[PDB]
Design a protein around this ligand. Structure first.
Ligand SMILES: OCC#Cc1ccc(O[C@H]2O[C@H](CO)[C@@H](O)[C@H](O)[C@@H]2O)cc1
Length: 158
C-alpha cells in the first residue's frame, strides 16, 4: 500500500509524510463553503490485492493558520461528514485494487462572521491530514501524513 499526489509527491510502503499544494477559490463570502477536495490530489493503491485487503481511515485532521482562525469546518470522508478539526477516527475505506484510487477526503470551510480580509495566505499551511492504513494480513498500522498548503490567497469580502 502506497500513495501519490498530483504535485508529484509520494509516500511509500510503511508510511511517511508528504506535502500537497492546492489551488483555492480566491474569493469566498461569509456563509459559503470553500471546498478543498483532496480526492483530486491524493491517490492510493493496494500492492497485493490478490491476497490482501487494505483498510484506510482519516485518523485525524487538524487545521492551521488562517483556516483554524477564520473558518468553521467540516470534513467529508467517503460519504460522511464530521467536524473539522476532527474529534474521532473515521470508518475504514476498503482498498482492494492496485489501480490508483482517490483518497475520498474533502474539506468544507465556511468563513466565520468576522473573517473578512485575507483569510488564508498564499503558501501557508492550512491542514494536516493523517491517513491510517491497516490490512487483513498482518499487524501493519501505518500513518501517511499529508501537509496541505495553499497556493494562493483567499479573500473574504466585507
Ligand atoms: O509473496 C508475494 C508478496 C507480497 C507482499 C506482502 C506484503 C506487502 O505489504 C505491503 O502491501 C500490502 C498491500 O497493499 C499492505 O497491506 C502492507 O501494509 C504493505 O504496504 C506487499 C507485498
Amino acid at each position: 500500500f502506497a500513495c501519490k499526489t498530483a504535485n508529484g509527491t509520494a509516500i511509500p510502503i510503511g508510511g511517511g509524510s508528504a506535502n500537497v499544494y492546492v489551488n483555492l477559490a480566491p474569493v469566498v463570502n461569509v456563509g459559503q463553503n470553500l471546498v478543498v477536495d483532496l480526492s483530486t490530489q491524493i491517490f492510493c493503491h493496494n500492492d497485493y490485492p490478490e491476497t490482501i485487503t487494505d483498510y484506510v481511515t482519516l485518523q485525524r485532521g487538524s487545521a492551521y493558520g488562517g483556516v483554524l482562525s477564520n473558518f468553521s469546518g467540516t470534513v467529508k470522508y467517503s460519504g460522511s461528514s464530521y467536524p473539522f478539526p476532527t474529534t474521532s477516527e473515521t470508518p475504514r475505506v476498503v482498498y482492494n485494487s492496485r489501480t490508483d484510487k482517490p483518497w475520498p477526503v474533502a474539506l468544507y470551510l465556511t468563513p466565520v462572521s468576522s473573517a473578512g480580509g485575507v483569510a488564508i495566505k498564499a503558501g501557508s499551511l492550512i491542514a494536516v491530514l493523517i491517513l491510517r492504513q491497516t490490512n487483513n494480513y498482518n499487524s501493519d498500522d501505518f500513518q501517511f501524513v499529508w501537509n496541505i498548503y495553499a497556493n494562493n490567497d483567499v479573500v473574504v469580502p466585507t
